[PDB]
């Protein structure tokens, strides 16, 4: 026990040293130097599409790089690919397991990924010579439910799971290439950088970590929130990111300052966050809530600029097009809507 | 003119053919009932599902599945055994099930409080409201001999047992001992007390006594699903 106590003392000393190092750099606060800029409080928008046809509640959706086609997942056991402009259905894939909770769309548009409560990630080929969508690969090795996945290219993909780990895969061989093993609680969100050199994740231990894809190691950790984290997103320029939690607050972190520098909250909000996203320029921050309403935040002044209403059950997913022309949201009422 | 042709191909071929299959699948989805099975490792829930499968899919990876049919109605039952210790996130995937099956080892006095706490937590969760529960007290045969042996007492775990008295609604079996009935109904009332306290009119619980060698368990679930669906249909037509 003496050695364990000694190691605990060393950990405490290093924690104190890091906290002291952080405080030295806090010369100014963002709210005190962005005080003189203009507000953007005129934001108001209306829904003008409604995609209908899912039988059960929706968990995940993702935009294509052309910003016209998108995919969605529902726990009735279907993946539907939609055409946003005409609202026509172009594909419908029945899944082996009904308890899906994530999906992704390849940047090249040739493949889609899927997975969930069966601890497996499945890859589907959308352009085979026969003209029929068919399963092409299954990835196994996680010991917990799959929670998120994002393509790097046609041949490799990154994933996070409830077993407290993340992995990098080679689709051709089907083998894990790297494993990330720092978090203490369940991991259920990840975000790729614009250059795909590094990525960030958040877990149930109320902390986030920065990972190096090639070196396979962590070099930063953030501890602002005070409860479970379930959403995360990068800033457009890649120097910051935003986080959402069930303590009913959002926070912004800076990679280079290594510190928290903004919080978004209001007294009359008690529900938790479920989604986060940024507009094309980064001035606006959009987030979904368990009150099935969505608030638009002035990310640079910290005020609310608007609200999106029209769903009648928990808002589950949220996404912005690659060119910033529209925003799509899903909900547990089994409908999906496009705004502005 | 090619734009018109592409629009025609899309709207005619893809959308209508997809919608036809979706309409076909909707009936099959609506005609089936899906259930969630919960319990500790010492309970005999696996014995229950195997026994009622013998009365009449397979494999397991993250989840285990079971099929059974009674009066030409299909039931699907799921057992989430591939996950680790914490429940609070994957539990809310089942907000849409018709009912939850809860199994308890009645003969284990030491572990009864843990099951009671789990039942309370499940009952009072935000996303698990409005869902009824079927409660099974599983090991009456062991409880009978444990009580009649007298070596281990109940009041050392539940001191309120000394003041308990059997209710007038008790229906003992013909050969049962009165004190076995007393302990058995006390254990049942422990769960019913939590159930009736915060339970609103939209939420009900159905207790049962069962044993390892038992064959009516399939029909009981059918009879309880009957009652809750009947209440739902009464509610929609403003009759409740």
């Amino acid at each position, epitope marked *: 026990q003496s050695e364990l106590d000694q190691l605990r003392q060393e950990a405490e000393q290093l924690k104190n040293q890091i906290r002291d190092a952080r405080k030295a750099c806090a010369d100014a606060t963002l709210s005190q130097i962005t005080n003189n800029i203009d507000p953007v409080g005129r934001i108001q928008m209306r829904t003008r599409r409604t995609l209908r046809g899912h039988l059960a509640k929706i968990y995940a959706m993702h935009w294509g790089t052309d910003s016209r086609l998108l995919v969605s997942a529902s726990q009735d056991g279907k993946l539907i690919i939609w055409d946003s402009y005409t609202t026509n259905k172009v594909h419908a894939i029945p899944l082996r397991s009904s308890w899906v909770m994530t999906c992704a769309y390849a940047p090249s548009g040739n493949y889609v990924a899927c997975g969930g409560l069966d601890n497996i990630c499945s890859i589907y080929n959308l352009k085979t010579r026969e003209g029929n969508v068919r399963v092409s690969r299954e990835l196994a090795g996680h010991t917990g439910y799959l929670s998120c996945c994002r393509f790097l290219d046609d041949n490799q993909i990154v994933t996070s799971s409830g077993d407290t780990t993340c992995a990098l895969w080679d689709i051709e061989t089907g083998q894990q290439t790297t494993t990330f093993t720092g978090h203490t609680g369940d991991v259920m969100s990840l975000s790729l950088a614009p250059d795909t050199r590094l990525f960030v994740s958040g877990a149930c231990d*109320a902390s986030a970590k920065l990972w190096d894809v090639r070196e396979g190691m962590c070099r930063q950790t953030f501890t602002g929130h005070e409860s479970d984290i379930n959403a995360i997103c990068f800033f457009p320029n890649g120097n910051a990111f935003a986080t959402g939690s069930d303590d009913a607050t959002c926070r912004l972190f800076d990679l280079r300052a290594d510190q928290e520098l903004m919080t978004y909250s209001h007294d009359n909000i008690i529900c938790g966050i479920t989604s986060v996203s940024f507009s094309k320029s980064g001035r606006l921050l959009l987030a979904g809530y368990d009150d099935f309403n969505c608030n638009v935040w002035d990310a640079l002044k910290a005020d609310r600029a608007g609200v999106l209403a029209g769903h009648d059950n928990r808002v589950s997913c949220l996404g912005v097009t690659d060119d910033g022309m529209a925003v799509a949201t899903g909900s547990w009422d089994s409908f999906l809507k496009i705004w502005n | 003119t090619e734009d018109q042709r592409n629009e025609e191909k899309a709207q005619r071929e893809a959308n209508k053919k997809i919608e036809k299959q979706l309409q076909k699948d909707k009936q099959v989805y609506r005609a089936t009932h899906r259930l969630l099975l919960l319990g500790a490792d010492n309970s005999g829930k696996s014995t229950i599902v195997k026994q009622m499968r013998i009365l009449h899919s397979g494999g397991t990876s993250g989840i285990f599945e079971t099929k059974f049919q009674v009066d030409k109605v299909n039931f699907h039952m799921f057992d989430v055994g591939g996950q680790r210790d914490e429940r609070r996130k994957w539990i809310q995937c089942f907000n849409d099930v018709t009912a939850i099956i809860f199994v308890v080892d009645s003969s284990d006095y030491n572990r009864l409080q843990e099951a009671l706490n789990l039942f309370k937590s499940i009952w009072n969760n935000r996303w698990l409201r409005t869902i009824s529960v079927i409660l099974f007290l599983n090991k009456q045969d062991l409880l009978a001999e444990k009580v009649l042996a007298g070596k281990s007492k109940i009041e050392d775990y539940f001191p309120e047992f000394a003041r308990y008295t059997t209710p007038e609604d008790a229906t003992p079996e013909p050969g049962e001992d009165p004190r076995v009935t007393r302990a058995k109904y006390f254990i049942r009332d422990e769960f019913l007390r939590i159930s009736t306290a915060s339970g609103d009119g939209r939420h009900y619980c159905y207790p049962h006594f069962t044993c390892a060698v038992d064959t009516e368990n399939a029909r009981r679930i059918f009879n309880d699903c009957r009652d809750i669906i009947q209440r739902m249909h009464l509610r929609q037509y403003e009759l409740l």
Partner: nanobody
Amino acid sequence: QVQLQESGGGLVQPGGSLRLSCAASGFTFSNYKMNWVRQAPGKGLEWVSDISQSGASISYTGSVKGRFTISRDNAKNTLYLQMNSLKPEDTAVYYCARCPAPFTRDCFDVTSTTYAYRGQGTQVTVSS
């Protein structure tokens, strides 16, 4: 940084008295519910007691009713446990835990292994 630090404990004779203290920081203490949990030698974690946000609706396990008492002090962010007439089987390590959400009645995973929002623990021994 959420952290909990227990205090008190030590050795006591059978029939003796003792009390524990728990200090919390890094979150709004007045919003959450609090718990006491212990682990005896060669056994898993076990339920003891809890207390709500305002200090009403207290509950105990049947093994310690009439002997143990729980209380809060919201103005100081501290939690107490008063123990009287201790018995030999009370020897265990006692932890300070809080339920995961700020306004709910749910306390699913407080007794789970490797739970996040729990302290390090203190040793209590009863012997002749």
